[PDB]
């Protein structure tokens, strides 16, 4: 029974390091590896500065060969906003670096 990123709107990241669409997620909490939609340690949407455009990609890249630490870290925090009410980089708000 894999732990997973519960909140994903379209995607889910499993504690094994895969990113999968909701439709392909198993009822055991793991991503279905047998389906091509499941990708391993997918750092897509991530820039060299360690920031990513999607939460699940951030979590997956954080587990590149720690789950709670990656889950908490990738979230937007006070360090991701400027003047309290604007993102510093709206396109890459999630950062694992």
């Amino acid at each position: 029974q894999c732990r997973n990123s519960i909140q994903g709107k379209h995607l889910i990241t499993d504690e094994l390091g895969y990113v999968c669409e909701r439709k392909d997620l198993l009822v055991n909490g793991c991503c279905n590896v047998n389906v091509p939609s499941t990708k391993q340690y997918c750092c897509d949407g991530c820039w060299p500065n360690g920031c990513c455009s999607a939460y699940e990609y951030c979590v997956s890249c954080c587990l590149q060969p720690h789950f709670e630490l990656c889950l908490a870290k990738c979230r937007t925090s006070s360090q991701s906003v400027q003047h309290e009410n604007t993102y510093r980089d709206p396109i890459a708000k999630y950062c694992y670096g």
């Binding site: 439709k23 009822v27 006070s78 309290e84 009410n85």
Partner: protein, 744 residues
């Protein structure tokens, strides 16, 4: 003395053995004392403010927590709740978004169940905050917040209580009358193009409820921030009653309260939502609940009211603007949902359903636990001369991933009806039809737009939406009482048929005007359409004085524009050789034996000679703001009538102040004047009051008057719908296409 918990019969649930056990409740307030005698199971206290203390200096976090989980004296709903106290407010109730963002993550880390936010803010364009609430609610946190304490004005809702996924709580009194302070109205995210959802969700007692004191005892407080924790206590208590905890999510919890509320008699649904909370009945609904989708409101009836106001205020007819009801979907089956196919409109031919055509827009994916279904209703041609009732229902289907217990892996499914009932009447004559301009309104939150009456220091923003159902509600009701059918224009001037409407009413406009719009409007007026323009103050010098420091963002804010965008109106009004001045005026005056009050309006700089201009004496408010000196100005042109020389042409009425029809802080109402001016525009009848008056004077010629100018480096383009963000000398975008609907 009173006990709110007993008034809602919470002790009946206590006798059943339910007391809030193992429910993790987070109170986001001014903190709590270290060893307060009234509380058990206070598992943590943390501080997210810059102040170095976890104690409750103000006592608001103590009152809120006690209403939820107090066990002594004035008792609470959930004595055994696992309280979590996160101090995010100062002793004077100041807070910042970064504090909330950091605290919200910690609440996710600690897997809290019920979160209470007693103090909200008008801003909803703060995307970092709004996204975190969605991320929070996506992690199964039931959020409860107050709608605000700025009533009885409409359009005064607060965020995040105005979100679809949050339970927004209002305030009634112990006689079940709506508390005067409680915020009311529809949401305003969707304006001008759309329509707002129904808020508040439910109301509860918020007048003189007694709760814990800082060191002990009990004390009284009033507000919707008092009404919110009453629901958080009920929500915490109800969550403990559920045998199968998995059924509890933000959608299902909200559905229970919605369906168990009691409807206050004589009050509309934008004041009470679904009604007053009923704790016992809500418990019964959860006891027999099945994961299902539901709609708020559950049915459409534009005929029977006062519950369904404004929709009952006037019937529909052929050629009228579409009637839109933004209906909320709550999906208790999953965080992510979907609408299987197009919703189905099913008219009842036995009851004239075919006289209606219904259109639908909806969310791509319902997330988190909620979404919307906007229904647009219009009358077909066959009913243009018909009077009666048209009926039918709408069917939607929601699907969500497979539940854990289902080994089959099939999608969950729920089907919901939505009855529709409408009153149709023959299309009224043009003279009786008034079009209301909403497209050219700009408002906070998006950007800084100053107040209209500069004496109202306490409210420095224009944020109520400027709608005939929010802060022009009293104007709207009087016009209906006079027989005028008022309709709203949510798209540029290039998107309405002038031949349908006798008068176009522009009140306190801030937006720039497309060149195509000006040309189109000129032709419509030449063909018998009338313009009534109520304006407000504008001055580049006064604006630089109205500048104030915004503490919540830590940055100085300059007015994007004045009360009204006088330069933009002048570019529109040039085609008839008319314009406005950049003067400031206030003071009392009399017209036709009626007392009047000029709030901060401007004056008519230029007017055609053939027109009727009545002029008055006023105090120079511009000098006071700039230099605190006093002066009186005689013969100020504030009202101007005109008739287009072309045969069958329209009329233009100019009035320099918008505040006599606004409810925000009304001192005197100028509805008698609006009625007389609509009589002139709708029938050409010049009243004796505005023609025999001794206040008449030769219309100003505009010789030597300095034209108002746009402020240097103003950032209005960042938020304008017309202007490109060129960072300097902004220019209009291409004219956007008119909106279209896909009728079923």
């Amino acid at each position: 003395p009173r006990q709110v918990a007993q008034t809602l019969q919470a002790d009946v649930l206590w006798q059943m053995g339910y007391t809030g056990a193992n429910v993790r409740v987070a109170v986001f307030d001014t903190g709590l004392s270290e060893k307060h005698p009234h509380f058990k199971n206070v598992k943590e206290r943390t501080n997210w403010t810059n102040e170095r203390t976890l104690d409750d200096g103000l006592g608001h976090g103590t009152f809120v927590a006690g209403v939820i989980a107090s066990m002594r004296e004035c008792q609470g709903f959930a004595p055994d709740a696992e309280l979590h106290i996160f101090r995010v407010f100062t002793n004077n109730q100041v807070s910042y978004t970064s504090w909330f963002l950091d605290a919200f993550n910690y609440a996710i880390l600690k897997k809290i169940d019920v979160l209470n936010l007693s103090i909200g803010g008008p801003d909803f364009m703060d995307h970092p905050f709004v996204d975190k609430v969605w991320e929070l609610t996506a992690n199964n946190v039931i959020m409860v917040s107050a709608i605000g304490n700025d009533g009885p004005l409409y359009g005064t809702l607060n965020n995040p209580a105005d979100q679809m996924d949050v339970i927004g709580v209002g305030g009634i009194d112990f006689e079940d009358n709506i508390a005067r302070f409680s915020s009311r109205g529809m949401t305003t995210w969707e304006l001008p193009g759309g329509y707002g959802r129904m808020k508040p969700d439910i109301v509860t007692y918020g007048a003189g409820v007694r709760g814990s004191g800082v060191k002990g005892g009990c004390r009284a407080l009033s507000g919707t921030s008092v009404a919110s924790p009453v629901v958080a206590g009920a929500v915490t208590l109800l969550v403990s009653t559920v045998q199968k905890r998995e059924l509890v999510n933000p959608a299902s919890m909200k559905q229970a309260l919605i369906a168990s509320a009691r409807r206050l008699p004589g009050v509309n649904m934008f004041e009470q939502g679904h009604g007053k909370l009923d704790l016992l009945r809500a418990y019964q609904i959860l006891n027999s609940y099945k994961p299902q989708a539901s709609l708020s409101p559950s049915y459409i009836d534009l005929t029977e009211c006062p519950y369904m106001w404004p929709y009952c205020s006037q019937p529909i007819y052929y050629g009228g603007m579409p009637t839109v009801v933004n209906v909320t979907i709550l999906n208790g089956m999953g965080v992510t949902g979907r609408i299987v196919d197009k919703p189905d409109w099913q008219p009842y031919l036995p009851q004239n359903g075919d006289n209606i055509e219904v259109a639908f827009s909806y969310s791509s994916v319902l997330w988190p636990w909620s979404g919307y279904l906007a229904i647009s209703i219009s009358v077909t041609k066959k009913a243009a001369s018909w009077e009666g009732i048209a009926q039918g229902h709408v069917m939607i289907t929601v699907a969500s991933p497979a539940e854990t217990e289902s080994k089959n892996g099939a999608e969950q499914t729920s089907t919901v009806k939505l009855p529709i009932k409408v009153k149709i009447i023959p299309t009224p004559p043009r003279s009786k039809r008034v079009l209301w301009d909403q497209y050219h309104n700009l408002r906070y939150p998006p950007g800084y737009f100053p107040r209209d009456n500069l004496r109202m220091k306490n409210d420095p923003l224009d944020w109520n939406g400027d709608h005939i159902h929010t802060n022009f509600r009293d104007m709207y009701q009087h016009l209906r009482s006079m027989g005028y059918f008022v309709e709203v224009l949510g798209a540029p001037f290039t998107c309405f048929d002038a031949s349908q409407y006798g008068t176009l009413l522009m009140v306190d406009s801030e937006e720039e005007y497309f060149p195509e719009e000006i040309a189109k409007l000129r032709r419509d007026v030449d063909n018998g359409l009338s313009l009534v323009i109520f304006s407000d103050w504008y001055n580049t010098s006064v604006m630089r004085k109205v500048k104030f420091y915004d503490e919540n963002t830590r940055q100085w804010w300059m007015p994007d524009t004045g009360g009204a965008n006088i330069p933009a109106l002048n570019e529109l009004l040039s085609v008839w050789n008319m314009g406005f001045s950049d003067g400031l005026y206030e003071g009392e005056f009399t017209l036709a034996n009626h007392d009047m009050y000029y709030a901060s309006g401007c004056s008519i700089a230029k007017f055609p000679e053939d027109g009727v201009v009545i002029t008055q004496t006023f105090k120079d408010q511009g000098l006071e703001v700039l230099k605190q000196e006093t002066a009186v100005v005689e013969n100020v042109p504030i009202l101007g009538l005109y008739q287009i020389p072309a045969e069958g042409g329209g009329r233009i009425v100019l009035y320099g102040d918008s505040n006599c029809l606004d409810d925000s802080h009304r001192q005197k109402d100028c509805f008698w004047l609006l009625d007389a001016l609509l009589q002139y525009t709708s029938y050409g009848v010049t009243p004796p009051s505005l023609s025999h008056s001794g206040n008449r004077q030769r219309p100003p010629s505009g010789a030597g008057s300095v034209t108002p100018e746009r402020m240097e480096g103003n950032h209005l383009h960042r938020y304008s719908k017309v202007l490109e963000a060129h960072l300097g000398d902004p220019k209009p975008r291409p004219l956007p296409a008119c909106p279209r609907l896909s009728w079923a």
